């Protein structure tokens, strides 16, 4: 069904740009991922029936929550595609293979609940996974799908390479734990400014891949303002539903997850953009200068939040 999809020609041109919004093409998302895989890895990387069976299985294991959903999977994959494209050489074939599958799988089975929640209100997942709670469960969900019948898209690789790619993926998914991000950036900014950053160093590499994942995970802030506005509505809904359950167990949530304090959201993003996004895409533009448009967009959206602050 999926397997004879062919992407529209106007979309072949625009999918290459950073600001591209997948949003209005819901039925084309599976075929846009397939297209994106073929363009970056080639038409022959996986067996089509294996890929399409996997791609649809992933989709099934994403829930109908307001933000951390199938749409967000394809969005973050797209932005990876764009970075990989604009910096093709730097990364290996096995990295390209893994990061796109990673971005597409990185929130597999999200419920709308932060690590923080799952840990406080003592839940199984926090039981099994002490830290980066959900981000582990996502990688687990990735492998259970990878090991369904006819779903193992990697089976034509050696054991050696199957366990390299799965590492790349594990690392990547885990790194989308925004908790881990902040310390990662600081190392990169330093490794950069001290003339010492060496893409050849495996450990330096994984950090950059890490920073890449966070640039991708957050890339909603790098789209035209109306799309960015509308997406924040989607996360904050998810955040608010979370905050309501803290209220139903007699605990005030942080303002961010309290729907009654929605006035403060503009300042919340103003911080998040200053504390996280601007620095995120600023270290990324230093390491990979062809990703500059991402920092460009972030800044435009910052002043929109700043504008909203002062009555405009």
Ligand X SMILES: CO[C@@H](C)Cn1cc(-c2c(C)nc3c(N4CCOCC4)nccn23)cn1
Confirm if 305 and 312 have CB atoms less than 8 A apart: no
Residue 110 marked in a binding site = no
Nearer to Mg ion, 107 or 258 (CB): 107
Tell me: is residue 19 an annotated ligand-binding position.
no
Is 110 known to be catalytic? no
Residue 178 touches which member of Zn ion, Mg ion, ligand X, none, C-beta under 5-8 Å by kind: ligand X
The number of beta carbons lying within 10 Å of the beta carbon of residue 65 is: 18
Rounded to a whole number of angstroms, the minimum distance from the CB of residue 312 to Mg ion is 32
Residue 231 within binding range of ligand X, rule CB under 6 A: yes
Site residues for Zn ion per CB under 5 A:
107, 217
CB neighbours of 60 closer than 8 A, spacing ≥ 6?
none
- The answer to whether 239 contacts ligand X (rule: CB under 6 A) is yes
- Residues between 161 and 190 with contacts to ligand X, criterion CB under 6 A: 178
- Using CB under 6 A, pick the residue from 220, 222, 283, 285 that binds ligand X: 220
Taking CB positions, which residue lies at the least distance from ligand X? 114
Decide: is 116 part of the binding site for ligand X (CB under 6 A). yes
**269 carries a ligand binding annotation:** yes
208 binding partner (options Mg ion, ligand X, Zn ion, none; Cβ < 5 to 8 Å by kind): none
Task: List the catalytic residue out of 19, 38, 68, 110.
Answer: 68
Nearer CB in complex with Zn ion: 157/180:
180
Any contact of residue 238 with Mg ion (CB under 5 A)? no
| CA-wise closest residue to 74 among 285, 229, 219 | 219
* 106 annotated to a ligand binding site: yes
- List the alpha helices (DSSP H) in 106-224: 115-120, 124-128, 133-146, 159-175, 178-193, 202-217
Residue count (the chain): 312
What is the C-alpha radius of gyration for the chain, rounded to an integer number of angstroms?
A: 19
Using CB under 6 A as the binding rule, whether residue 28 contacts ligand X is answered as no
Nearest to 224 by CA among 301, 116, 305: 301
Q: Of the candidates 65, 79, 107, 222, which one interacts with Mg ion according to CB under 5 A?
A: 107
The secondary structure of 22-78 as a DSSP string is -GGGGGGHHHHHHHHHHHHH-TTSS-HHHHHHHHHHHHHTS---SSSSHHHHHHHHH
Element housing 250 (H / E): none
Helix, strand or coil, per DSSP, at residue 104: helix
215 lines the binding site for ligand X (CB under 6 A): no
Shortest separation between residue 58's beta carbon and ligand X, angstroms: 20
User: Which of 190, 217, 204 shows the shortest CA–CA distance to 272?
Assistant: 217
Q: Does 258 bind Mg ion (CB under 5 A)?
A: no
Residues in binding site for 3',5'-cyclic GMP: 68, 269
List interacting residues with Mg ion (CB under 5 A).
Answer: 107
Interacting residues toward ligand X by CB under 6 A: 114, 116, 178, 218, 220-221, 231-232, 235, 239, 256, 268, 272
Which residues are designated catalytic?
A: 68
């Amino acid at each position: 069904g999926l397997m004879q999809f062919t992407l529209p020609v106007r979309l072949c041109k625009e999918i290459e740009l950073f600001h591209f919004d997948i949003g209005p093409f819901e039925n084309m998302w599976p075929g846009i991922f397939v297209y994106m895989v073929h363009r970056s890895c080639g038409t022959s990387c996986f067996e089509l029936e294996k890929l399409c069976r996997f791609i649809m299985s992933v989709k099934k294991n994403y829930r109908r929550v307001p933000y951390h959903n199938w749409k967000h999977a394809v969005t973050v994959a797209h932005c990876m595609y764009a970075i990989l494209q604009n910096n093709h050489t730097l990364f290996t074939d096995l990295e390209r293979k893994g990061l796109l599958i990673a971005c597409l799988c990185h929130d597999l089975d999200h419920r709308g609940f932060s690590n923080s929640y799952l840990q406080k209100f003592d839940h199984p997942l926090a039981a099994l996974y002490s830290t980066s709670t959900m981000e582990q469960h996502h990688f687990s969900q990735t492998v259970s799908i990878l090991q369904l019948e006819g779903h193992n898209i990697f089976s034509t690789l050696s054991s050696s390479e199957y366990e390299q790619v799965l590492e790349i993926i594990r690392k990547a998914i885990i790194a989308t734990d925004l908790a881990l991000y902040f310390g990662n950036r600081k190392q990169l900014e330093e490794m950069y400014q001290t003339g010492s950053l060496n893409l050849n160093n495996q450990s330096h590499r994984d950090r950059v891949i890490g920073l890449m994942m966070t640039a991708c995970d957050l890339c909603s802030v790098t789209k035209l303002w109306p799309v960015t506005k509308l997406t924040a509505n989607d996360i904050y809904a998810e955040f608010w539903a979370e905050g309501d359950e803290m209220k139903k167990l007699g605990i005030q949530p942080i303002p961010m997850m309290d729907r009654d304090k929605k006035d403060e959201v503009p300042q919340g993003q103003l911080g998040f953009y200053n504390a996280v996004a601007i620095p995120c895409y600023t270290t990324l533009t230093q390491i990979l200068p062809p990703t500059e448009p991402l920092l460009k967009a972030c800044r435009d959206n910052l002043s929109q939040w700043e504008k909203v602050i002062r009555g405009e």
